[PDB]
Design a protein. Structure first.
Ligand SMILES: *[C@@H]1O[C@H](CO)[C@@H](O[C@@H]2O[C@H](CO)[C@@H](O)[C@H](O)[C@H]2NC(C)=O)[C@H](O)[C@H]1NC(C)=O
Ligand SMILES: *[C@@H]1O[C@H](CO)[C@@H](O[C@@H]2O[C@H](CO)[C@@H](O)[C@H](O)[C@H]2NC(C)=O)[C@H](O)[C@H]1NC(C)=O
Ligand SMILES: *[C@@H]1O[C@H](CO)[C@@H](O)[C@H](O)[C@H]1NC(C)=O
Ligand SMILES: *[C@@H]1O[C@H](CO)[C@@H](O)[C@H](O)[C@H]1NC(C)=O
Ligand SMILES: *[C@@H]1O[C@H](CO)[C@@H](O)[C@H](O)[C@H]1NC(C)=O
Lengths: 170, 320, 319, 170, 323, 169
């Protein structure tokens, strides 16, 4: 991947996380389980839908009959007409085929980017109070309950609050 | 206490290609390629087409007895097995152009431009039939034209004009007959060395019979060439002949329409609506590309020879 | 208590918006339009060469010497131009001639068959008509002479011209088809006649088609107009026993690959452009254009786009 | 969005920075203010300018007189002509529209990247002699005057010179 | 004790452009532009072209004495004329629907020349042994087209001529004929006796009546008269009839053929070789998998798209920073 | 560069490393040398060739005889024919040109991304037992020999088995 996350340092997907494209797997006391970050997911859904709609709605074609009829003494112009039809065919075929090959890669880089961003948003908050145990996981150096997890996902993680405890468990 | 970042995976088997790697299984995808059609010939702009059944455009516009047959149509349909056209062998001048120009009309009216009963008091307008254009097995002729012959061993010079008092173009068709021998020429028209002149304010051409024995076609050694022109509103067209003229009887006032097409298919016509027509069926799609048929009529998606154009929406599926 | 260094990006008062595949109406700090949507409302020179404007006439009226009518990049006709052919008839291969005259360098009208000495045995004055009037008087084309019989006889005429212009010579002529026998004899005497015109490439024989056609400008007869291009060293020959409207003036010209004809009421002006439109000219910097699909010169590609804003800056977020 | 900086962790832009695309706002004992990074800004200018001139200059247009004149018995070839013009019309409209959507997205991502790299290039110098307080800001652990600030702005930052002192205020 | 993560560099001087930057040095790169050709005219789809040598299509099809008349392969994939092909219609006149004929003969899967009207047995009432002219010289002597016969009056009369051909060949037959237009009335009589004449040619689809047009035209190859050439295709089972009281240059040889689609005509001095190609250019064949080419816009076959580009350097390696 | 590695924090390339596109240079008590990362060099090679093949193989053109012959009285349709050939010329020239420009950008960005991902990969292993001394170099906070220097290259490095030695330094 272009951003390293999907099929990278995060090697597999979570069937458990049926509620969205990107999310979190939290584990403390109290409980655990998968939960999708609906925010980055809804944004992703909106933007990708606008991508698909962009490729479709931008066509809007002219009214044309295409078919032409030429007699046995009109072979040159019949062959010109054919060159036009085939010319358009090679153009649209090549263009459609590449559009799909190119944009498909872009769409993948985009999902990869959304994940990498999520992961870095967490990493920058925690810092010391947690261990980057690879595979996309963070092991906390302090008890992190529901409202703590929710805090990290919500970007309002209170580093000072757990600073003291974190250092000790190190 | 652990917190992990991750991405969704599902039971998806969909695959898409990317510039960097082929056959990538993704969670969600969508097709940009329309490959479905309804196997019907439908209406365009809400207007049904003109189906000519077993007859072609030539046999229909000329009034071939085999085609007994609206006032509008978005396009014309001819069955691939449409022989019924020029029953009397000859050359149909600018036939392709006429077909094209009749492909779509917003208004169309057949009227009797030269009434049969009162137009030719010095010529015979009843013996003009042939075994080449049979009606119910009997010698007949085009319903829209009249094959004039001498009356009582005399073919006077004829001169007849029509003024287009309609508020639109009038399609006028006529013919020029070429007997195979001087004996037939004299038997039909008497005068031997004849001429036909047709001219409007735009159009002007002189015709001279070309007498020779040509290869039998539908048992006829002679030939009959067919001509046509559109007479502009207010314009006049004049016919003048000493023989060999196949005069107009019915002409067509019409309002020609932008520019449509002619589909030659066995595909049945139904009571459906479409914006894009194919000889194989109609395309009801919002997609930008199509692989049903290159020869379409209407507002259609682009034709490609792709078999698959699958757009990735979701991400790579790795259930593991 | 800490000193601080912040990293950030530019924001401004710009209201420009652009669309991206992922999101519509994104305000950005700087942008540019790829879509040219403005024209100078003028018809200018192309390649620094002025177009040929035909005033109130069309090409037929101009190229034939219609009484009422050096090099150029294209031709301009007004939509309400007058008839060129005053005497009714067919101008054979007319669209082709228009196309071939659309653009030329070197163009010179010269008297190919001088009126004074070319026709001692025929009358070159009486050939005027009510179809081609001029200042209350019956007249005719300036570039052609309608020859008629001189004193009850029209001898066989035979006239040849050798092209000694080191370029193509455009030669036009007419064929007259009287409405009836009397007019035929009144004009040409001979009753049954023919005309022949041939060069090393061109060759056609004509015969009058006597008939009463619908009256157009009081003429029940007809006149058909023909032309051909005589190669540099070639010879062209006219032969007739009547009904021949002979060339008087012909045109030596050098044809350019070709441009076209603009039919518009848009005023012609002394300006330069690389791309001409019937509505006006456009300076070709941008790749795309939505002024007009019918253009001449080196033009942007026509598209049906209303806006093609290209982002140059970043998303503008003043807040 | 692709690189997480613009409208990401650096939520907003600066109307106060009027001499460049990317730059800094400093705050020390000697005073504060905005200063655009001239290197990364000029480079972005040279490249976005190259991008614009690329989409423009690669359009080699042949000399063409699009219009054609056909008489009443040439509707077929007249319509062929129409099909040619309409075919080029749909091809250019669709490509132009997508080219702009696609390039606009790349342009925004490109700027996003330029900011991200500027942030993390400063962050590699400072290391632990300052804290990432967020919003693209650095709160120094030591005292950083003007000459110190400018050394950070233009690469030549002396980290060991302040290691002693940074350690203290922590 | 160190470990470093780095990337390749080399002596390479290859350069490519990106939307952002011009002439960027890169480690590896390939060209997407085919700018090479083999400088030969090759067999297309495995079939040799028909090369007409010093003749054009008109001279070959009519049997100009200078052209090689079948011989001529029973098939070809396209036609080659040299830019110096001088020998065509040695007797001046118009070749009706010439371009159509050239296009329609451009590719044929089967072609056979045959004596449609044997010179000896076909015209007992006319002279078929004097139709030669200085306009069409051969071994330093008056001659004529090999596939046509210039029928002249026998003794001092030219009786009504009427001869037909039924197509027993299992395919289309190309028939060509001429109409002679003498310069003067005296020449008309000297040749065909009858001062006023007609020619008729018709089949089940074709029909046209010709009338001699006597006039003194500019002298071309010493001829002030003219000879127009016509052709038509007689489908299998059909008949073509010729009727004339003079001025008819009758067919002697016609051609049974089975035409293919498309193909075209190359006009070039580029040598024909025993090579195979899928894409042919007037200056050389193209052998490439590349999608773009700048050799020539006029090509025949399944070709790369023509472009004006001079190069299309596509990067494969990375930015090359040897430092 | 888009990912700030190539010509970024890793200023230059290694002429000395010839067996790959990306790789390592080790320097321990035993010795030094260059060693390309095979698995990543090969993937980039698989994907670039696929990129080249895809651009090439999607062009599947029709059999066409472009040329046309028109007489001196068919100038209009001759020019119509010219407009078709010219229109195809402009469309394909522009498309080919921009395709190369845009894909060259993406390719260079691609490599840049691979380098960064490899660097962040080893950084993800040497966690606390090494220091990012800059310029894409790690300086082991402990002492690493050849056997250890190959566990990092293969992704099997052992952090806990060095965490004690590193903590003191
Ligand atoms: C001469 O010009 C007049 C206009 O000045 C022509 O009148 C037009 O005729 C055409 C059909 O031939 C119509 O389409 C136009 O609507 C007519 N104009 C109007 C409003 O009257 C006329 O056709 C020309 N006459 C000749 C002899 O060619
Ligand atoms: C074939 O073309 C050649 C020229 O390439 C013609 O040869 C010339 O014929 C004229 C007329 O007799 C002679 O005066 C010249 O001496 C010939 N020139 C050369 C180069 O030999 C020839 O006439 C043509 N043959 C036919 C029948 O078309
Ligand atoms: C999430 O963040 C917002 C501010 O962006 C804050 O108001 C809200 O209380 C936070 N929620 C949690 C779980 O703390
Ligand atoms: C018109 O422009 C052309 C170049 O586009 C130039 O050759 C010519 O001199 C210009 N004429 C005037 C009057 O500027
Ligand atoms: C095409 O090129 C290949 C080598 O790439 C060569 O082997 C082959 O003979 C060539 N084909 C022709 C017919 O030129």
């Amino acid at each position: 991947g272009l951003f390293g996350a999907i099929a990278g340092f995060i090697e597999g997907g979570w069937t458990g996380m049926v509620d969205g494209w990107y999310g979190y797997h939290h584990q403390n006391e109290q409980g655990s389980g998968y939960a999708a970050d609906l925010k980055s997911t809804q944004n992703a859904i909106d933007e990708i839908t606008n991508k698909v709609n962009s490729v479709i709605e931008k066509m809007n074609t002219q009214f044309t009959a295409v078919g032409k009829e030429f007699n046995h003494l009109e072979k040159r112009i019949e062959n010109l007409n054919k060159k036009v039809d085939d010319g358009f065919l090679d153009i649209w075929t090549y263009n459609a085929e590449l559009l799909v090959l190119l944009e498909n890669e872009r769409t993948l880089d985009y999902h990869d980017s959304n994940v990498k961003n999520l992961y870095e948003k967490v990493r920058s908050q925690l810092k010391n109070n947690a261990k980057e145990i690879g595979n996309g996981c963070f092991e906390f150096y302090h008890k992190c309950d529901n409202t703590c997890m929710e805090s990290v996902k919500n970007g309002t993680y209170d580093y000072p609050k757990y600073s003291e405890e974190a250092k000790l468990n190190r | 206490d652990t917190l992990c970042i991750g991405y969704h995976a599902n039971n998806s088997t969909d695959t898409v290609d990317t510039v960097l790697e082929k056959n990538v299984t993704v969670t969600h995808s969508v097709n940009l390629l329309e490959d479905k059609h309804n196997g019907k010939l439908c209406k365009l702009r809400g207007v049904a087409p003109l189906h000519l059944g077993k007859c072609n455009i030539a046999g229909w516009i000329l009034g071939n007895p085999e085609c007994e047959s609206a006032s509008s149509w978005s396009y014309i349909v001819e069955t691939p097995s449409s022989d019924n056209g020029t029953c009397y062998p000859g050359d149909f001048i600018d036939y392709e152009e006429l077909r094209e120009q009749l492909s779509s009309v917003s208004s169309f009216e057949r009227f009797e431009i030269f009434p049969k009963t009162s137009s030719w008091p010095n010529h015979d307008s009843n013996k003009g039939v042939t075994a080449a254009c049979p009606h119910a097995g009997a010698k007949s002729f085009y319903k829209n034209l009249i094959w004039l012959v001498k009356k009582g061993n005399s073919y006077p010079k004829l001169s007849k004009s029509y003024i287009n008092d309609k508020g639109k173009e009038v399609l006028v068709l006529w013919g020029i007959h070429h007997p195979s021998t001087s004996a037939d020429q004299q038997s039909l028209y008497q005068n031997a060395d004849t001429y036909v002149f047709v001219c409007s304010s735009r159009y002007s051409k002189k015709f001279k019979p070309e007498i020779a024995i040509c290869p039998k076609v539908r048992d006829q050694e002679g030939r009959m060439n067919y001509y046509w022109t559109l007479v502009e509103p207010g314009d006049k067209i004049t016919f003048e002949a000493t023989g060999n003229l196949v005069v107009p009887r019915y002409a067509f006032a019409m309002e020609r329409n932008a520019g449509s097409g002619i589909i030659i298919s066995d595909t049945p016509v139904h009571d459906c609506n479409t914006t894009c027509q194919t000889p194989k069926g109609a395309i009801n799609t919002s997609l930008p590309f199509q692989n049903i048929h290159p020869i379409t009529i209407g507002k259609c998606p682009k034709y490609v020879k792709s078999t698959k154009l699958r757009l990735a929406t979701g991400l790579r599926n790795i259930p593991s």
